[PDB]
Write an enzyme that holds these catalytic residues in place. Structure first.
Site, PDB file in Angstrom:
ATOM      1  N   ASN A 273      -8.602   5.914   3.014  1.00 21.25           N
ATOM      2  CA  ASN A 273      -9.330   6.838   2.157  1.00 21.25           C
ATOM      3  C   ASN A 273     -10.134   7.947   2.851  1.00 21.25           C
ATOM      4  OD1 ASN A 273     -11.999   7.372   0.414  1.00 21.25           O
ATOM      5  ND2 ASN A 273     -10.282   6.995  -0.976  1.00 21.25           N
TER       6      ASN A 273
ATOM      7  N   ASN B  66      -7.174   9.625  -5.876  1.00 23.46           N
ATOM      8  CA  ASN B  66      -8.000   8.772  -6.716  1.00 23.46           C
ATOM      9  C   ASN B  66      -8.806   9.633  -7.687  1.00 23.46           C
ATOM     10  OD1 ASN B  66      -8.399   7.314  -3.588  1.00 23.46           O
ATOM     11  ND2 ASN B  66      -7.331   6.234  -5.240  1.00 23.46           N
TER      12      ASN B  66
ATOM     13  N   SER C 140     -11.054  11.679  -3.908  1.00 23.00           N
ATOM     14  CA  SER C 140     -10.627  11.326  -2.563  1.00 23.00           C
ATOM     15  C   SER C 140      -9.121  11.063  -2.584  1.00 23.00           C
ATOM     16  CB  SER C 140     -11.383  10.088  -2.065  1.00 23.00           C
ATOM     17  OG  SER C 140     -11.059   8.938  -2.828  1.00 23.00           O
TER      18      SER C 140
ATOM     19  N   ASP D 297     -15.592  -3.297   9.704  1.00 17.21           N
ATOM     20  CA  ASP D 297     -16.667  -2.829   8.834  1.00 17.21           C
ATOM     21  C   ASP D 297     -17.607  -3.944   8.390  1.00 17.21           C
ATOM     22  OD1 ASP D 297     -16.765  -0.990   5.644  1.00 17.21           O
ATOM     23  OD2 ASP D 297     -18.309  -1.476   7.133  1.00 17.21           O
TER      24      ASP D 297
ATOM     25  N   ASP E 214     -11.963   9.784  -8.108  1.00 17.99           N
ATOM     26  CA  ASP E 214     -13.175  10.325  -7.501  1.00 17.99           C
ATOM     27  C   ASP E 214     -12.898  11.568  -6.660  1.00 17.99           C
ATOM     28  OD1 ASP E 214     -11.906   9.070  -5.303  1.00 17.99           O
ATOM     29  OD2 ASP E 214     -13.821   8.577  -4.376  1.00 17.99           O
TER      30      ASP E 214
ATOM     31  N   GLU F 171       0.828  -1.202   0.000  1.00 17.17           N
ATOM     32  CA  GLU F 171       0.000   0.000   0.000  1.00 17.17           C
ATOM     33  C   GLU F 171       0.866   1.256   0.000  1.00 17.17           C
ATOM     34  OE1 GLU F 171      -3.061   0.667  -0.371  1.00 17.17           O
ATOM     35  OE2 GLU F 171      -3.969  -1.332  -0.239  1.00 17.17           O
TER      36      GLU F 171
ATOM     37  N   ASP G 111      -5.826   8.810  -0.474  1.00 17.48           N
ATOM     38  CA  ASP G 111      -5.444   7.764   0.474  1.00 17.48           C
ATOM     39  C   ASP G 111      -4.239   8.270   1.267  1.00 17.48           C
ATOM     40  OD1 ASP G 111      -7.390   6.093  -0.665  1.00 17.48           O
ATOM     41  OD2 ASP G 111      -5.975   5.368  -2.170  1.00 17.48           O
TER      42      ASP G 111
END
Ligand code: NA
Length: 129
Positions: free
Chosen positions: A59, A46, A50, A101, A48, A35, A52
């Site tokens: 995110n 990203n 957003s 989650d 969109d 990562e 990281d």
């Protein structure tokens, strides 16, 4: 800060990640490797909008607030910048929320494509834990 393989393992183990929700330490070190390459200052944007952040590339759309991600939820109630600290405490606390989650570690794309189903034990071998 750029962590050493075994140094990160020990730090993660001390923060209670070994076998958290059934995921052995090897899984967490493998995820961090692919990562961010063990770099706490890693950031990637990203499409969109957003971004990281940190060692575990958390995110901004759902977990942290960076002030530039419209409609973000900030589930970990923390500024994304806190995830770039040399002290991984914040990243670890938020990761525990994420993995609980519902989709487990599959939330991390690199873990799914590069760690899942492999010999993750290899990532903590030779380490003094
Ligand atoms: Na957010």
């Amino acid at each position: 800060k750029v962590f050493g393989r075994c140094e990160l393992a020990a730090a993660m183990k001390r923060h209670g990640l070994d076998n958290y929700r059934g995921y052995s330490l090897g899984n967490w070190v493998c995820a961090a490797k692919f990562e961010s390459n063990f770099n706490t200052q890693a950031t990637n944007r990203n499409t969109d909008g957003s971004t990281d952040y940190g060692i575990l590339q958390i995110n901004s759309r759902w977990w942290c607030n960076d002030g530039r991600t419209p409609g973000s939820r900030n589930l970990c109630n923390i500024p994304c910048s806190a995830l770039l600290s040399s002290d991984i405490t914040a990243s670890v606390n938020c990761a525990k929320k994420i993995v609980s989650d519902g989709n487990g570690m599959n939330a991390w794309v690199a873990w799914r494509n590069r760690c899942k189903g492999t010999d993750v034990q290899a990532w903590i071998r030779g380490c003094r834990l």
